[PDB]
Structures are given as structure tokens and as C-alpha cells.
Ligand binder design. Structure first.
Ligand SMILES: [Br-]
Ligand SMILES: [Br-]
Ligand SMILES: [Br-]
Ligand SMILES: [Br-]
Ligand SMILES: [Br-]
Length: 360
């Protein structure tokens, strides 16, 4: 059942904010040459900078963000994998300026791209458990998780859900394996083996606007939870019903994903990924994706939808804290736009976030 099939043609129920929700938000380093309409109040910052981090930790507490997801490039690109950790260690060092109640923890958004896996080249291609032999790519796969487990074993600031370090895997539907559960159980056993029985909580991303069971064979027995990429990624052509009735579309799709993934045949948590806006035309004006302007009324309705789809994890993911390249950020802007006269969203979206996901 896809998006048209799952839209209920009637008002979305009100979901009250009664417990605190566990909110994670993607953290990024934007390209600052793009033509933004407003600018960050912390000013420009690169992957090498650290002065922005305290400001962002403050912003994050203003928003009720419990953890940031930072990119992790696979060890196959050695330099990029090194940088991924350097960035997080610089973040972690800035956490030492904060009390325990103000700490905003971290976790990784794992990118296996460098392994060169696709459908024709699975991660387990020459893996044979019975000759104790692993595909070269599976070795690297494992090493990427060992390195994460090592960071978490040694750093209480690595975000844990119920004692388990959280890992998000980008494009998890394309992590081609002849046997996804066997690959993941081998990796989990290797982590348990090396880190005193550590268990991980792995979130797998699927593409937006797609059925929640389309990629069961990639997720069932493999990951702990599934989410979609933001539904604010949408071709402006032939999407008339979806843009017009968006909040109802996402409500329909997410609550259905939460029900359907949660059946005993599958046994997977669903975690909604939300966005306040998007603009894919920033990186390239030929991107046909529709621009979602920031709209408070809409964003609150989306947050309500997400609350309608949350499960036992109590978890919601925000695309994004500061993914300015695609217009999804909530990072505090200056009070005026680049024109020097029009009011900008400022800190409005941090405050909305705390209202929509933390108990008053
Ligand atoms: Br700096
Ligand atoms: Br809070
Ligand atoms: Br021991
Ligand atoms: Br389905
Ligand atoms: Br770019």
C-alpha cells in the first residue's frame, strides 16, 4: 500500500504531547556559496571549526534536540572516515563546557557508498561462513561498525537508546546483500564479541513516498527500525494531490508504516523523519523538486502527524538542524533576510520543535 492508497480523506486526529520524545537531528556542513535568503546567526563555519559548536548546543537545547547525527564515511575512503571522527571528537570536546542536563549527544549517519555495493555486487558476495571466509567488502563493513562501537564503548556522549548505541544507515534499502539478516547478525556478533556484549540500535533509511514493506528483505531481521527520507522531497510535476494535502498524506503514510512494520511477521520500529521546509533548487536550479517554504501552521501539523506514527522508541528524526544546502534547516537565522528588511524565521523553528516534542 503506497501514498494514494493510505491517505484517509478526513481530519488528522490531535495527538497530545504527554511524554518527552527522543529527537535526533541531522548535522551538516553547508556550502556557504549558495544563494540563501537568510543566514545563520552563528555565521559561516566549516568542518574544521569549533566555535559554532557551543552555539549549536545551545540552539539544540532550545529546540529539545536530544542528539545530532553526524556523517560517517566508510573506512574504504580512509581520509573521509578519519575526518568523520575528527569532527565528532571536536564536537565531543565542546560538550565538556556543558552540564549533564545540557549535553546534546551524538551518533553516526553511516554512508557505505565507498564500498561500491549495488544489486550486482552484494556486500556478502563471496562470503562463506562454513570456510570461515568473508567478502572483502563485508570485512570493511564490519570494521566500520567496530570503529563505531569503539567510540561508543569509550564515550558516554555517544547516544544510546535503552543502552544501545544508535546507528543510522543512509540508503539502507540499497545495501545489497544475498542475506541481509546473516550479514547484520555477523556484524552484531563481531561487535558483541569485541565490546562486552554491546548491542546496537540500527535505523535503516528508505526513499520517501514509498511503501513501508517494499524493502522487507533488506530490513527484517537486519535493522531495528526503519524511517523514510523526508517526504518534502517531491517532484513539482504530477504531485498535485500530494502537495495540496501534504499533512494528510504524511499522516496516512507514517501511521500506516508504524502499524505495518510493527506486525509480528516483520517486528520493526518505524521512526518518522520530519522537515520544516525544503529547497532542492539551491544546489542546482534545474532540480525539479518542489520548494516547501517554511510555514508554521503546516510544520506543526507535520509534527502532529509524526506524533501519530511514533512507537516504542519514542523517536522522531529531524531533517534537519543545519542542512542548509537543501533548505531543511532549523538553525537560528539572523532576524532579517539577506535583503536587510524582510523578517526571517530566526529562532522560531527551534521553539516550535520544543513545543511539539517536549512536555510543558
Ligand atoms: Br573555530
Ligand atoms: Br528538553
Ligand atoms: Br573482559
Ligand atoms: Br506496504
Ligand atoms: Br553544493
Amino acid at each position: 500500500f503506497g501514498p494514494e492508497d493510505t491517505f484517509l480523506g478526513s481530519p488528522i486526529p490531535i495527538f497530545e504531547v504527554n511524554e518527552d520524545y527522543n529527537v535526533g537531528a541531522f548535522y551538516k556542513f553547508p556550502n556557504w556559496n549558495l544563494n540563501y535568503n537568510e543566514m545563520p546567526v552563528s555565521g559561516t563555519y566549516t568542518a574544521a571549526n569549533t566555535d559554532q559548536f557551543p552555539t549549536h548546543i545551545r540552539q539544540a537545547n532550545k529546540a529539545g534536540i536530544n542528539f545530532f547525527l553526524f556523517d560517517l564515511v566508510s573506512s574504504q575512503n580512509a581520509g573521509g572516515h578519519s575526518s568523520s571522527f575528527d569532527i565528532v571528537a571536536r564536537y565531543n570536546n565542546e560538550l565538556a563546557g556543558f552540564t549533564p542536563d545540557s549535553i546534546v549527544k551524538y551518533a553516526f549517519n553511516y554512508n557505505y557508498g565507498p564500498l561500491g555495493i549495488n544489486n550486482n555486487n552484494p556486500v556478502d558476495s563471496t562470503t562463506d561462513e562454513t570456510t570461515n571466509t568473508l567478502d572483502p567488502k563485508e570485512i570493511v563493513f564490519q570494521q566500520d561498525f567496530l570503529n563505531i562501537a569503539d567510540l561508543a564503548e569509550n564515550n558516554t556522549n555517544y547516544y544510546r537508546l535503552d543502552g544501545k548505541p544508535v546507528v543510522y544507515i543512509l540508503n539502507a534499502q540499497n545495501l545489497a546483500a544475498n542475506d541481509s539478516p546473516a550479514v547484520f547478525n555477523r556484524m552484531r556478533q563481531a561487535v558483541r564479541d569485541a565490546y562486552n556484549g554491546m548491542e546496537l540500535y540500527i535505523i535503516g533509511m528508505q526513499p520517501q513516498w514509498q511503501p513501508p514493506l517494499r524493502y522487507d528483505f533488506r530490513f527484517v531481521g537486519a535493522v531495528d527500525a526503519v524511517t523514510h527520507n523526508t517526504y518534502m522531497q517531491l517532484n513539482e510535476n504530477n504531485s498535485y494531490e500530494r502537495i495540496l494535502y501534504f499533512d494528510k498524506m504524511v499522516y496516512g503514510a507514517w501511521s500506516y508504516s508504524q502499524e505495518a512494520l510493527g506486525r509480528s511477521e516483520f517486528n520493526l520500529e518505524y521512526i518518522p523523519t520530519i522537515s520544516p521546509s525544503s529547497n532542492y533548487k539551491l544546489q542546482n536550479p534545474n532540480n525539479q523538486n518542489y520548494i516547501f517554504e517554511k510555514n508554521e501552521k503546516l510544520f506543526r501539523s507535520v509534527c502532529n502527524a509524526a506524533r501519530g506514527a511514533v512507537g516504542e522508541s519514542k523517536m522522531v528524526l529531524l531533517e534537519s538542524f543545519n542542512n542548509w544546502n537543501i533548505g531543511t534547516q532549523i538553525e537560528e537565522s539572523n532576524e532579517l533576510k539577506v535583503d536587510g528588511v524582510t523578517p526571517a524565521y530566526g529562532d522560531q523553528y527551534l521553539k516550535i520543535l520544543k513545543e511539539e516534542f517536549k512536555v510543558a
